[PDB]
Design a protein around this ligand. Sequence first.
Ligand code: SF4
Ligand SMILES: [Mg+2]
Ligand SMILES: [Mg+2]
Ligand SMILES: [Mg+2]
Ligand SMILES: [Mg+2]
Ligand SMILES: [Mg+2]
Ligand SMILES: [Mg+2]
Ligand SMILES: [Mg+2]
Ligand SMILES: [Mg+2]
Ligand SMILES: [Mg+2]
Ligand SMILES: [Mg+2]
Ligand SMILES: [Mg+2]
Ligand SMILES: [Mg+2]
Ligand SMILES: [Mg+2]
Ligand SMILES: [Mg+2]
Ligand SMILES: [Mg+2]
Ligand SMILES: [Mg+2]
Ligand SMILES: [Mg+2]
Ligand SMILES: [Mg+2]
Ligand SMILES: [Mg+2]
Ligand SMILES: [Mg+2]
Ligand SMILES: [Mg+2]
Ligand SMILES: [Mg+2]
Ligand SMILES: [Mg+2]
Ligand SMILES: [Mg+2]
Ligand SMILES: [Mg+2]
Ligand SMILES: [Mg+2]
Ligand SMILES: [Mg+2]
Ligand SMILES: [Mg+2]
Ligand SMILES: [Mg+2]
Ligand SMILES: [Mg+2]
Ligand SMILES: [Mg+2]
Ligand SMILES: [Mg+2]
Ligand SMILES: [Mg+2]
Ligand SMILES: [Mg+2]
Ligand SMILES: [Mg+2]
Ligand SMILES: [Mg+2]
Ligand SMILES: [Mg+2]
Ligand SMILES: [Mg+2]
Ligand SMILES: [Mg+2]
Ligand SMILES: [Mg+2]
Ligand SMILES: [Mg+2]
Ligand SMILES: [Mg+2]
Ligand SMILES: [Mg+2]
Ligand SMILES: [Mg+2]
Ligand SMILES: [Mg+2]
Ligand SMILES: [Mg+2]
Ligand SMILES: [Mg+2]
Ligand SMILES: [Mg+2]
Ligand SMILES: [Mg+2]
Ligand SMILES: [Mg+2]
Ligand SMILES: [Mg+2]
Ligand SMILES: [Mg+2]
Ligand SMILES: [Mg+2]
Ligand SMILES: [Mg+2]
Ligand SMILES: [Mg+2]
Ligand SMILES: [Mg+2]
Ligand SMILES: [Mg+2]
Ligand SMILES: [Mg+2]
Ligand SMILES: [Mg+2]
Ligand SMILES: [Mg+2]
Ligand SMILES: [Mg+2]
Ligand SMILES: [Mg+2]
Ligand SMILES: [Mg+2]
Ligand SMILES: [Mg+2]
Ligand SMILES: [Mg+2]
Ligand SMILES: [Mg+2]
Ligand SMILES: [Mg+2]
Ligand SMILES: [Mg+2]
Ligand SMILES: [Mg+2]
Ligand SMILES: [Mg+2]
Ligand SMILES: [Mg+2]
Ligand SMILES: [Mg+2]
Ligand SMILES: [Mg+2]
Ligand SMILES: [Mg+2]
Ligand SMILES: [Mg+2]
Ligand SMILES: [Mg+2]
Ligand SMILES: [Mg+2]
Ligand SMILES: [Mg+2]
Lengths: 75, 96, 99, 82, 137, 122, 208
Amino acid sequence: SGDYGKLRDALEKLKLNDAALTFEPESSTALGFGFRCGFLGLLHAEIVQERLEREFGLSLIATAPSVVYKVRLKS
Amino acid sequence: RNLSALKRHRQSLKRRLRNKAKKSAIKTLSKKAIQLAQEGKAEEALKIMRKAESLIDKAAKGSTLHKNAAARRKSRLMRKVRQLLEAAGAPLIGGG
Amino acid sequence: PKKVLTGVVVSDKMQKTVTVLVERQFPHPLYGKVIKRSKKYLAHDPEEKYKLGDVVEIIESRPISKRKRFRVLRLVESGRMDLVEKYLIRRQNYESLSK
Amino acid sequence: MVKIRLARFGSKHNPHYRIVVTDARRKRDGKYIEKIGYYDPRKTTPDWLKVDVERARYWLSVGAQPTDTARRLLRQAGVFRQ
Amino acid sequence: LTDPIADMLTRIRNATRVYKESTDVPASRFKEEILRILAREGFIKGYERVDVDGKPYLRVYLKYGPRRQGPDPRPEQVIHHIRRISKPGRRVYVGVKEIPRVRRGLGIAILSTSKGVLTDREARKLGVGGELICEVW
Amino acid sequence: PTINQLVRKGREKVRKKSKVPALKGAPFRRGVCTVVRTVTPKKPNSALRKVAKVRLTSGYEVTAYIPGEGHNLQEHSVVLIRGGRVKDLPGVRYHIVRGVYDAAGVKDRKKSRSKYGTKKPK
Amino acid sequence: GRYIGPVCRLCRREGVKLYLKGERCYSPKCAMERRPYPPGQHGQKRARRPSDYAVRLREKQKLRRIYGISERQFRNLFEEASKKKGVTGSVFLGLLESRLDNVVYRLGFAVSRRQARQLVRHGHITVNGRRVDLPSYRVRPGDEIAVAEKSRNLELIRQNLEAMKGRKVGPWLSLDVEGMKGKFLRLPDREDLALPVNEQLVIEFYSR
RNA sequence: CCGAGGGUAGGGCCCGUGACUGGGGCGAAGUCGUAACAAGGUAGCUGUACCGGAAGGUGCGGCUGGA
RNA sequence: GCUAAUCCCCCAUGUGGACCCGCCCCUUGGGGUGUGUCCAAAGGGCUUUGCCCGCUUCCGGAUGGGCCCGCGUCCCAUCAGCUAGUUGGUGGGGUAAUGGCCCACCAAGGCGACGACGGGUAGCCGGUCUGAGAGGAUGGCCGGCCACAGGGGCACUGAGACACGGGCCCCACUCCUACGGGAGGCAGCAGUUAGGAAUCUUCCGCAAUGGGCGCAAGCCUGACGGAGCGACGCCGCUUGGAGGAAGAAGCCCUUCGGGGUGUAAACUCCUGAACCCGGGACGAAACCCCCGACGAGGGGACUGACGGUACCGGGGUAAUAGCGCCGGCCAACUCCGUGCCAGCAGCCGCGGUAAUACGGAGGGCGCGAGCGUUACCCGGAUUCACUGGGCGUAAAGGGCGUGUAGGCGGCCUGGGGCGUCCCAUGUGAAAGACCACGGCUCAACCGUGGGGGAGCGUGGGAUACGCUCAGGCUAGACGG
Ligand code: SF4
Ligand SMILES: [Mg+2]
Ligand SMILES: [Mg+2]
Ligand SMILES: [Mg+2]
Ligand SMILES: [Mg+2]
Ligand SMILES: [Mg+2]
Ligand SMILES: [Mg+2]
Ligand SMILES: [Mg+2]
Ligand SMILES: [Mg+2]
Ligand SMILES: [Mg+2]
Ligand SMILES: [Mg+2]
Ligand SMILES: [Mg+2]
Ligand SMILES: [Mg+2]
Ligand SMILES: [Mg+2]
Ligand SMILES: [Mg+2]
Ligand SMILES: [Mg+2]
Ligand SMILES: [Mg+2]
Ligand SMILES: [Mg+2]
Ligand SMILES: [Mg+2]
Ligand SMILES: [Mg+2]
Ligand SMILES: [Mg+2]
Ligand SMILES: [Mg+2]
Ligand SMILES: [Mg+2]
Ligand SMILES: [Mg+2]
Ligand SMILES: [Mg+2]
Ligand SMILES: [Mg+2]
Ligand SMILES: [Mg+2]
Ligand SMILES: [Mg+2]
Ligand SMILES: [Mg+2]
Ligand SMILES: [Mg+2]
Ligand SMILES: [Mg+2]
Ligand SMILES: [Mg+2]
Ligand SMILES: [Mg+2]
Ligand SMILES: [Mg+2]
Ligand SMILES: [Mg+2]
Ligand SMILES: [Mg+2]
Ligand SMILES: [Mg+2]
Ligand SMILES: [Mg+2]
Ligand SMILES: [Mg+2]
Ligand SMILES: [Mg+2]
Ligand SMILES: [Mg+2]
Ligand SMILES: [Mg+2]
Ligand SMILES: [Mg+2]
Ligand SMILES: [Mg+2]
Ligand SMILES: [Mg+2]
Ligand SMILES: [Mg+2]
Ligand SMILES: [Mg+2]
Ligand SMILES: [Mg+2]
Ligand SMILES: [Mg+2]
Ligand SMILES: [Mg+2]
Ligand SMILES: [Mg+2]
Ligand SMILES: [Mg+2]
Ligand SMILES: [Mg+2]
Ligand SMILES: [Mg+2]
Ligand SMILES: [Mg+2]
Ligand SMILES: [Mg+2]
Ligand SMILES: [Mg+2]
Ligand SMILES: [Mg+2]
Ligand SMILES: [Mg+2]
Ligand SMILES: [Mg+2]
Ligand SMILES: [Mg+2]
Ligand SMILES: [Mg+2]
Ligand SMILES: [Mg+2]
Ligand SMILES: [Mg+2]
Ligand SMILES: [Mg+2]
Ligand SMILES: [Mg+2]
Ligand SMILES: [Mg+2]
Ligand SMILES: [Mg+2]
Ligand SMILES: [Mg+2]
Ligand SMILES: [Mg+2]
Ligand SMILES: [Mg+2]
Ligand SMILES: [Mg+2]
Ligand SMILES: [Mg+2]
Ligand SMILES: [Mg+2]
Ligand SMILES: [Mg+2]
Ligand SMILES: [Mg+2]
Ligand SMILES: [Mg+2]
Ligand SMILES: [Mg+2]
Ligand SMILES: [Mg+2]
């Protein structure tokens, strides 16, 4: 952080040649503004992160993913 | 990737040499005259002055020298020479 | 027309040059009051015949040096060292305007 | 050299030229030395071509070269009429 | 005394407001020219030059309207308003095209011109301007 | 002051201060929501006022107001702010613009829809 | 463009006949002869001492609706009257009254001003021989306003024209019935139009 | 010779940022007391000095905007 | 190594011109003259014992430029001292040309509270916006000037450049090699990408106007003329017109009697945006050719990107409406819902279970292809007050003297005539604003004419007041 700029840009700047990649923003107490990413297989995930790291000089961390749990209280 | 601006460049080089060569002679012969005048040697001084006067005014037919460039060259040369001679005098042949 | 101004020689100190202090009057553009303004010109004195206190006329001229482009035209009045004294005091007051 | 030429004024599809003496090197609508007449090529008014004959010959006599369209309009005003 | 003219204007102002018959102003020939106009227009009855302990003064003879009816019978003033324009702090000069029109012509402006001391209307009639001395109405 | 004083010192032009510096000095600015919460107003009002802290393209970070009933913004929402304080929320100098970037229009709005960002319903 | 919409409601609000229809206007069928209180749920409640802004506002709206003009165009004509020399209230009425669609209605080619507008706009009117379909045209002194005769045998114009056989035109106009033509003589004096409008209030409106 | 600039060393100004620190503003219903407004229960205020959790108290002289 | 010329050089002629010296006039290096020296030129087409275009030198003109000077040109004094090519001199160098522009030598000077030096910001003007004016704000488009062409330096060629699409070097960056080296500069037109709240077609045509070259034919011209896209702005125009119930339904309100939407709809009549058919432009008459003489004058033909567009005639269809508001300011009110919640808010303030202030509804007001909002400028703000303000207690008299610069100065005469006033004249470009008229069917827009002033230059005049100089006076001031 806030390499975030160089990350959201890397993602966009690579999607426009990747039919399969999907991303979208999500926040996280640690480590902040990131992206929940859909890949079409584990080897496809390996290749994207290798592009980010090796062609965009990005140091990053793959985590999670987590889901939007809805809650119904009493209201 | 082209032009006739390359032509203008090439031609400019030819003229650069021509102007250089002419202004060199003009400076060399004026100095020689003024050096002869400083020793006087007035016969050879006025002769070289006239070949310097010649070159200067031939340079200003074309582009090497402006009219007023030649006139200022000619003025200062004929004043260096004459005044140097006047310090022991005798102006022999053509010139003043 | 070449400009002609009248002023006082305030400085002699220079070879063939006199400083001619020159004053003018005019209404303030907004507040209308008449105010005075002034400007020192270095004037060409080819015969060092002009000296301190000389109220003179200077004429716009072909440049003689840097920042020297008026020639002294004629003398108008002589020995007005009061005019000079005003100037110098003004300058000397500046010694007390520092930090 | 100096020129007698048309400077376009007017609006879109409404050309109104001033016939104008100016240096050749200015843009056609820029500063001109003198306005010696006008010209409405669509003849939308009775007097669609005025020329101050005296000044035109003065600039003519002094060396100002009329274009071609300006020459024709000057001619058509008998400026060259011997 | 920094402005004699102003002092005359205030000497006349302060006296009329208490309905004096007369008031003295120290003598000067410029002031006479001004008084002369105030006389010539009927803002004052007139003046004479007097001696007050051997010094020269100008006794101005003041003028009012008729005694009025009702509570407060004090007469209307002839000189309602007399005030300096040009002053030692700011001199005020006008060209002939900038002569003001005091109270739509029910008042006057007095000026000093190189053709004499004039009113706004003689100034315009002699085609000259000058220093705007005062307005009176 | 005297005329002379005015000649010596002039009058001072009074120079207006911007209530809206983070715009710098455009009419709107884009940003990413970093915090989205409710805030309470000052006296004499009681409410749970809806608000975002916004990191701007201008480099500023500001708290903006989310007008209208209901909203769809969470942390990391891209947003557009206009000038305009909310008087009950000291610190809130700007309004988010409904219906731009990730900010939905106000749902079921029928009046004043051009504010609140709501298209004319069929 | 122009308003288009119920107009009785307009005359009802202004509290006076604006004669926005021609024929029904002089009938007892008019809502003003019939129910002369402003439209909506509250027309029948008691009034409230109008603010002085409303009195000028309603006076300006009155004069403007009469002629069917936009506020944009009404505002420009008023600005011209003001910037022009001469008493602004009158030059304003003159400038309004010099309108083409208005001179058509005033002449009698149409029963109402909205119709004259359509008459001008549909090509049925000529200024000095040439067809002129612009409703805001500035008719000038000595202009001949006439019916384009390729629509001279038109059932509306004939009817309305025959209705002028007899009726007088304003002291500032002339009309050759069955010539189907008229002149704008001079521009009208304020006394000529008996308008239900204190136009100086309009001046006070726009000087707020 | 001069010369873009590179370099070496030393100054000056400005901006950003900094563990920690100073006080400030603001914030619907926290804690302590009650200094001022009515000889506000020791008339008030005041410049300085010293002291005290806090307002403040006291001294010296001043003001009346207290008798 | 070959070779031509309107390429280069040399000899000649010298109308003239340049330079040194003398002399005359003139007065900064302007003009005339004498002797000495020095300086020119180019050919091409043709119908040919003549014409066309070139060519050399000179003087003058015209135009355009360089340099210099007076005056005006933002913020901070919490920037107060600055200056060694610095200021001047002498002689040189350089240039078209003055100058410390450059250099050598000599002198010790120059500048600054009338703001030097430093910092910050900024292209400047005609104008534009606002304003009662005065003033304030601004410099987009168009016109004028300046500056810059990736960052920096440099000079060459030339009438002119230190040259955006010319050259050289260094740097940053990007791109190509075969490894030696090499390529590039959209702040031209389109266009891409990035940044951004946001800003357009990789269009058409050289028909017009203007430019360059050519004797001309003609060639090139992203100048320009147009077309495209964007309600971005202004102007014009339409979504109909007339009739049509004490008055449908629906919907809202209701004291359930009634009121409202509303002549609004329906429905009758008739007009005819769109669209269809036919026609169909102005802008284009010069260049050129012919007669004459290549001239004046006459006569003649060619040429349209826009565009099969505008526009005209004929036919022809009832045919987009929205947005803001309705507590006060401020034009427009009722019902329901909600219950300090949810929400509104420019200020005042509104919401705590009977809200004209929140949300919806019906009605209403405002404007209408728009309407609102945000940002900013002037106004309202005489709230920086020149016009046009204040200071006992509202903000605001320095703690009190003494005094420097400065500002200001009683009564009388003369000289000057700086301020000031007058008159004449020059300049105040064009566009724009204003008035008048005129052209597009109107208007917007455009054209022609007109009045502009202030300011500044020149010349003439005036002299009351302010000034200056000279001289007085005794009333202010000081002394005895
Ligand atoms: S009818 Fe009566 S109300 Fe309806 S328009 Fe004619 S006048 Fe106005
Ligand atoms: Mg040699
Ligand atoms: Mg010198
Ligand atoms: Mg409350
Ligand atoms: Mg409340
Ligand atoms: Mg709405
Ligand atoms: Mg107004
Ligand atoms: Mg260096
Ligand atoms: Mg280097
Ligand atoms: Mg620090
Ligand atoms: Mg801190
Ligand atoms: Mg106490
Ligand atoms: Mg107490
Ligand atoms: Mg107590
Ligand atoms: Mg007490
Ligand atoms: Mg104490
Ligand atoms: Mg104690
Ligand atoms: Mg005490
Ligand atoms: Mg008390
Ligand atoms: Mg040969
Ligand atoms: Mg020869
Ligand atoms: Mg030196
Ligand atoms: Mg020395
Ligand atoms: Mg000065
Ligand atoms: Mg800049
Ligand atoms: Mg004002
Ligand atoms: Mg701008
Ligand atoms: Mg410009
Ligand atoms: Mg660039
Ligand atoms: Mg470069
Ligand atoms: Mg470069
Ligand atoms: Mg560069
Ligand atoms: Mg050269
Ligand atoms: Mg050339
Ligand atoms: Mg270059
Ligand atoms: Mg070039
Ligand atoms: Mg350059
Ligand atoms: Mg380029
Ligand atoms: Mg481009
Ligand atoms: Mg390229
Ligand atoms: Mg983009
Ligand atoms: Mg972007
Ligand atoms: Mg583009
Ligand atoms: Mg365009
Ligand atoms: Mg062309
Ligand atoms: Mg051409
Ligand atoms: Mg449009
Ligand atoms: Mg009924
Ligand atoms: Mg009903
Ligand atoms: Mg019903
Ligand atoms: Mg009913
Ligand atoms: Mg109807
Ligand atoms: Mg229907
Ligand atoms: Mg039909
Ligand atoms: Mg044509
Ligand atoms: Mg057709
Ligand atoms: Mg509204
Ligand atoms: Mg309003
Ligand atoms: Mg109301
Ligand atoms: Mg609301
Ligand atoms: Mg309720
Ligand atoms: Mg409201
Ligand atoms: Mg409501
Ligand atoms: Mg419109
Ligand atoms: Mg304002
Ligand atoms: Mg007002
Ligand atoms: Mg003001
Ligand atoms: Mg004042
Ligand atoms: Mg005040
Ligand atoms: Mg107080
Ligand atoms: Mg106080
Ligand atoms: Mg005191
Ligand atoms: Mg005090
Ligand atoms: Mg004293
Ligand atoms: Mg003194
Ligand atoms: Mg004095
Ligand atoms: Mg005096
Ligand atoms: Mg004078
Ligand atoms: Mg002009």
